[PDB]
């Protein structure tokens, strides 16, 4: 499967996550945690039968990598870390690779070999300001793989600064509501959600509860949760409340067609929410 | 996969169904409707290589067939009928094995080759009052059959009628909520969820809101669903909106481990809610 595999075990892995940080397994069953992780070890190891020799994944062993595939293992990998054990060879590997491999000179991540499921890869899908779509959400990976990765991986915090930098440069121009929401939570993790680019970030929003873009649904809900984790960063919490009451009423649609990315932001942020 | 297929199939089918009946693709995003069909179809058809020559399923075609799945796959399919193109020779296939082969003289369904995935068959896994939990839910699949069925199975009927009085027999004694939510349903459909078994189902809800069991929310969540079923073929609307609001408050899993039952249900009786 290669990207089916990630497809599927996604809401497990951001489900666990989220009972964890939220302690609320007593109500879910506390006997039910060991066989959710034992999906989730199925998972990891399934995924390595599609990790290519250059530590790069792709849907099928003979399909070229993809650049965005390779950060989403990254992404999913380094939070199912303190769940389950994953090899750090593993992580760090595909880590050095989109470093090394996939990032242009001024910062940018580039995509040579896109993904088959491209209702897996939420908001990106729109290709309008992919640029800042895939340099946003690689940048969160690898920030997210810092943990485990930048011990070995020393050009790491330099790849995530030139990245960071490019989205600056690119920020106040942005039309998309899901851009602005996504490199908005990346300058927030680079402590660069400042001042101009602040105002825009949150000038995007719609009643302040919302960074949506018209029919599409779950675009929105991951943009808002970006969006949401970027305002905890900053600990406005002045304009949280509001986000996430809204976020809280989305009807997402869990192992449902195209909910891959809202169903892990979504979780994610609103881990992030209670535990800040 | 056999059982995985299902379980991988259940969001999407049952997420558009809600789409569906509540008329709610333009916030969704119109053109996302037939991707989503897609899906649908290439899991019928990947369902179809599990149909063993007796109509049954099974996680694999060497394992003697689950009297369970076939059901889920009756249930889902009648549903899916409205979606796709079903073949009327697979769904009263299934549903002519489980009535000639798997019902006892006393109107009670019986499973021989338990599903490997527990975590698929919600409440059902709890085996206590598993007869009556069985019989339920496969009387239920009957029933969502009929419309498709009934004419190329003349025997659904009587089958039908033979569960339910079994499930009535048994109703007023029954100790678990889960099992009372199921059954009751399944009478209410039977149109025999009157006087005695009535104040014995709606006097087995918690604060009038749900059917609950300790420390199992998924359980909870599907059984609380096929409550406010049952409480919408009674047109009783006094008891129906306490109902609808805890279960618009479960934060229910979606494509995770252990919610194949509760996603299915949820989006099944949230859909006739508003289509009532």
Redo the contacts between chains.
Sequence with gaps: CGEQNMI?M???VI?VHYLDQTE?W?????E?RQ??LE?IKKGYTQQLAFKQPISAYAAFNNRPPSTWLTAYVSRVFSLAANLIAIDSQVLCGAVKWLILEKQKPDGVFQEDGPVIHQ?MIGGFRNTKEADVSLTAFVLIALQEARDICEGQVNSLPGSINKAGEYLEASYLNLQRPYTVAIAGYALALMNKLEEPYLTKFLNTAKDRNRWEEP????YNVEATSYALLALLLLKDFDSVPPVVRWLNDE?????????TQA?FMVFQALAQYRAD
């Excluded at 009807?251 to 909910?259: I, K, M, T």
């Design positions: 599927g996604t809401p497990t489900a609320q007593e109500k879910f069953g506390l039910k066989e959710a999906l209702e029919g599409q649904q779950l009807r997402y649609y869990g192992g449902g067609y195209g909910s169903t």
